Design a protein around this ligand. Structure first.
Ligand SMILES: CC(C)=CCC/C(C)=C/CC/C(C)=C/Cc1c(O)c2ccccc2oc1=O
Ligand SMILES: CC(C)=CCC/C(C)=C/CC/C(C)=C/Cc1c(O)c2ccccc2oc1=O
Ligand SMILES: [Fe+3]
Ligand SMILES: [Fe+3]
Ligand SMILES: [Fe+3]
Ligand SMILES: [Fe+3]
Ligand SMILES: [O-]
Lengths: 264, 263
């Protein structure tokens, strides 16, 4: 029921105070679809940096981890729900940035050179959305203080700008920087799940929020452990995909077709 | 198949040579789905300015029209198929910016304020994608010279700048601005149909490009007129959407649900 009569209306303002808020609208219809026994066997992997830019990309992520794990006491003391969710609530505010600068910029280019993009943009945006559904999820399990919020705001100002210019200078540097961040994120989310398997972390949030149960399509009886498992598997897809784009840059392939649009 | 053994692979660089260049993968799977008999009756509306910000929007769009229509010599002489494609080519580059910058700025806003967007982001990113498809479609009908290629590149620089600062400063203003640009879009586009029906324009490009076919799900028999039909339907949507989104801002409803997700 979207046709010429609706296309000729000036505005549908007047219909806002009667539309349901619905958790399944918060994203596109392009949802991850995982099966837990399968993605159960996601694994920690490392790709060798293959020259200066890769090495410089890796040294950066590795530098930031050591830095980030230390100014946020993440090794000091036992693992906890509070510290884990707090970590991921923050780190996901940054994860949602690179895909939107990457998607924007290729869009921006495509229009000003009138070229095809051959599938890249789309992958890049729904990654960025996916990463933000990780946050929409986490922000429901824990609300943060003025400190952590302010500190989040100041971060985006920094990571947005850096990724903006990094992507203009060298897309290859950015796609390898995210690829390596995802290695670190499949290590974190594996450490969280391991801990659950080994009793060291007894999750309490085992009510998976509504945003999350529809987005990944989890059963009503899904545990916090199941939520980490699927989040984890999105980070691995990101891992393979950005590394593949990084690689494609390296080999003069930024204007060949996005291999993942078929491989879907 | 998409599972762990793929997610556990390090790169799919070896595959790129064998993955074909299908034209459906140029856009997302969120395609428009019009009915030519229906969208044939899409018409020309005009949202009334409220105050300063709406007027500003409106005087911006009219002065920019008057400028562009005289610098490009659109109104000088008889309409031709060429000066039609040429004009859309140019203007469709601009068209793709606003939705992507809103989308981006609202994405960033949901990221940092950890708030729920409620469906705005992906409507503006499809808007963005959709205009970009307009462009891709005309790039089949006319591959332009360097003078236009230059004009388009500087014209992005400025516009990106203008729409970025403006959208941070007053997203209401931007969405209105858009409404009016899309009003004009439809005037121009119904004119081109009028002028086809009256045989003052002979659509010599009736081999409607493959891209557009799979995008707008048109049959092989579809013509230029039918192509312009769906395209101008698209603009009529962006016309409403953007006047609604600005209305919502005017009322302080920026953080309320995107009506159009639940139509
Ligand atoms: C505040 C500022 C100026 C810059 C922020 C620095 C920054 C990007 C730090 C993160 C780099 C890092 C240690 C990554 C590790 C990591 C993740 O990125 C991550 C992302 C999502 C989910 C779980 C994650 O777990 C991690 O250990
Ligand atoms: C070069 C520069 C700094 C700014 C460009 C100014 C500018 C955007 C002018 C366009 C205003 C205008 C004439 C609107 C009419 C119009 C469209 O917007 C339009 C959009 C999509 C498809 C067809 C269109 O046809 C139009 O006539
Ligand atoms: Fe994440
Ligand atoms: Fe990530
Ligand atoms: Fe358009
Ligand atoms: Fe338009
Ligand atoms: O992430």
């Amino acid at each position: 029921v979207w046709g010429h009569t609706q296309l000729n209306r000036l505005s549908f303002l007047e219909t806002v105070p009667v539309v349901p808020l619905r958790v399944s609208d918060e994203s596109s219809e392009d949802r991850p679809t995982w099966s837990l026994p399968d993605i159960e066997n996601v694994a920690i992997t490392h790709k060798k940096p293959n020259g200066l830019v890769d090495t410089l990309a890796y040294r950066s992520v590795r530098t930031c981890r050591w830095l980030f794990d230390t100014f946020s006491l993440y090794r000091f003391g036992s693992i906890t729900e509070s510290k884990v969710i707090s970590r991921c609530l923050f780190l996901e505010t940054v994860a949602g940035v690179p895909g939107m600068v990457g998607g924007m910029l290729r869009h921006l280019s495509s229009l000003r050179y009138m070229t095809r993009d051959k599938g890249w943009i789309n992958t890049l945006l729904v990654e960025a959305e996916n990463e933000r559904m990780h946050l929409m999820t986490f922000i429901e399990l824990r609300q943060p203080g003025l400190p952590l919020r302010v500190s989040i705001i100041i971060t985006q100002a920094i990571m947005y700008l850096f990724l903006l210019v990094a992507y203009v200078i060298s897309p290859r540097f950015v796609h390898r920087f995210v690829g390596y961040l995802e290695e670190e994120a499949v290590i974190t989310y594996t450490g969280v799940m391991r801990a659950i398997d080994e009793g060291r972390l007894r999750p309490t949030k085992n009510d998976v929020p509504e945003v999350a149960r529809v987005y990944w399509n989890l059963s009503k009886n899904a545990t916090f452990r199941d939520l980490i498992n699927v989040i984890r598997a999105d980070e691995a897809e990101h891992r393979v995909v950005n590394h593949t784009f990084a690689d494609m840059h390296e080999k003069r392939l930024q204007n060949s077709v996005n291999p993942f649009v078929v491989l879907k």
